């Protein structure tokens, strides 16, 4: 791959597109003011799905020279426009009229199917150019570093709204068609082609004015303007936040957020015209959830952050796309946390991007964040959950290492320097290094140019009133000690806190050595020491036995912040699974979480204990670990109770469902008895139970029920009114324990009553229900492999079916059985999932064989 010759660079695009609806085509003429930087006889542009009618170049004050040479290269999406004579150095005007297609590929200038408040089914002209689809709406230099200004014009019917990046400056009628009106927009600033936007359709709107004076609007489908009210007030507060943080005003005169029906791209940060899918921007009061207002605040703060970082200053090449999305993925939580501190959104960030990035970065076949991108198709291949989640995680670690003071100063220097220009990743490290005086380029190179993350071991010794800390770093791997003689090293900024001040740093350090000693002044032995305050650093911490015991009071009295309790517990399970520490040591810490009120912490607690419970189901003391789970969740269960208390939040309803389902599955007698009261009153029409208690009650009564209970659930499903009620049953049907009922659920998955896209959910619940239910699900998909393969081959479902079925196995002999099965019955699209699952089975197998009897003897001694 090679970029455009750059012998002719654009200056201003004058576009006028007439979307031919019903015919699904469009015609448009382009007057591109350009500069000939080097004498050439041909101009090379990007173009796809567009046939040029005629094209001529008119130099300044001269006659136009029509092009008599056309060359369409579809594999490279580039077109060469040859001319009879050399164009010579100077300024000219490239005039190109052409015709295009409103394709069905949800890319470029395509058609968007929407339904009126009555029906009829109409189509709209919606745009989407990122990454390289602007060349399908009009021929252009479709590269982010080739910036120019845009004069957008649209010839739309009178009864249809035409939006674009800028505001409307003229609305004159169309002479050839009385039913059409040409809408001309203002001139955009210097920007990239992949951020240009224009949409044609029928939309209602709600408007407001931000404190900066910027006109904010939320465009909704016809008849849903009230649903975009919340997104409007969030966007109206988001602009002043980024204005104050960047010390740079909003670069455009107006901001628009339009909700589109079935918007495939999800969300696009088009400069001034941010597009969403209505299921992610609007809040339907009779269909939305509880945390929907939280999800809207995040998606609005993310794309509006790009209006500065990404649109005002754009990446030089797609190699730096991770930094554009990683920065926005981090500052979106900073914006929501400032406007809505009642969310404690940073605890959910650690539970989302942070932990998910540490899972992938600790396994084999990982890759560094920044990878050189040659062809723009290589993007879709080498960027994944690693480049974005770990990308946002290292930015958070960098912000904490810099400090919010110098970080704001460096970003203002960065934005003002490269405004309406382009920059690379190294340009950002320089602007931050100038404002902070810290070696940012050197530190960040260890986190971007190599894969993996370090494990920080810390040991404590009391020296007078101070405490000496001995730190060492090594590459962390989910399997254990990293085998390899390269010995990776990281420059690790570490924030340390003590019990005397658990919410602010006791000491900030930078570990640029494999081993390092640290002295904390005035730290009494009765005080605990916590590394990685706020879990801001992208690393795992292994505490010594003495240091871990000192942290137990901090967990119990909640003085340790919830985000710290989340990260501490998550590190303990990973270290025990890797064989670095014992599992018994982790189980003793679980007893200190009995006072935990935070939903996110319990969510990760329940997830980790669920992995261990299903792992220990292969042993002869599965009753002992269930009794242990009941003791951990009993106090929080009694605190929440069964009915919503006066003035609860939305997380307390979610936490009640998680806790009750955990106790119900573990056999908690009081929970099982009450769940049967609610279920028998729900099926007899005496009092329908809440939708929040519905899933835990179903799981509990079905696991501890019989064939009568299963028939009731099947009657609730075949009679279920909506699809949502069906899915809530399909996930819990696998909780049955009797073998003939398990086979009945598996057969029910492939029946006509279950839709094929939901069949994997039913079989997934069977594999996760019990040990014999997992073996029955694995045998079921082997006997019916011909049908299941024909159903989901080459799709996402076949990888999800294999994942949910075999990941729970804890026998190393079983890992060799799934690898041998897919060597005789190939599944090409799921080749990567089989390798991850086989490595995961061997990991759980070694973990089980190493710690089985130690856990057993711990549970017996604890009970006495
Ligand atoms: Zn983004």
Numbering used by the authors: 51 to 914
Text taken from the publication that reported this structure:
Most of the cytosolic aminopeptidase activity in the mammalian brain and likely other tissues is attributable to puromycin sensitive aminopeptidase (PSA). Overall, the enzyme adopts a V-shaped architecture with four domains characteristic of the M1 family aminopeptidases, but it is in a less compact conformation compared to most M1 enzymes of known structure.
We report the crystal structure of PSA at 2.3 Ǻ. The N-terminal arm of PSA can be further divided into 3 distinct regions: N-terminal domain (domain I, residues 51–253; residues 1–50 not ordered in the crystal structure), catalytic domain (domain II, residues 254–503), and linker domain (domain III, residues 504–594). As in other metallopeptidases, the two histidine residues (His352 and His356) of the motif coordinate the zinc ion, and the glutamate residue (Glu353) hydrogen bonds to a water molecule that is also coordinated to the metal. In addition, another glutamate residue (Glu375) present in α6 acts as a fourth zinc-coordinating group. In the crystal structure, the coordination distances to the zinc ion are: E375, 1.96 Å; H352, 2.12 Å; H356, 2.11 Å; and the coordinating solvent, 2.03 Å. The more open conformation of PSA, with domains II and IV separated by a wide channel, results in a larger and more accessible active site region. Notably, average atomic thermal factors are higher in PSA domain I and the second HEAT repeat of domain IV.
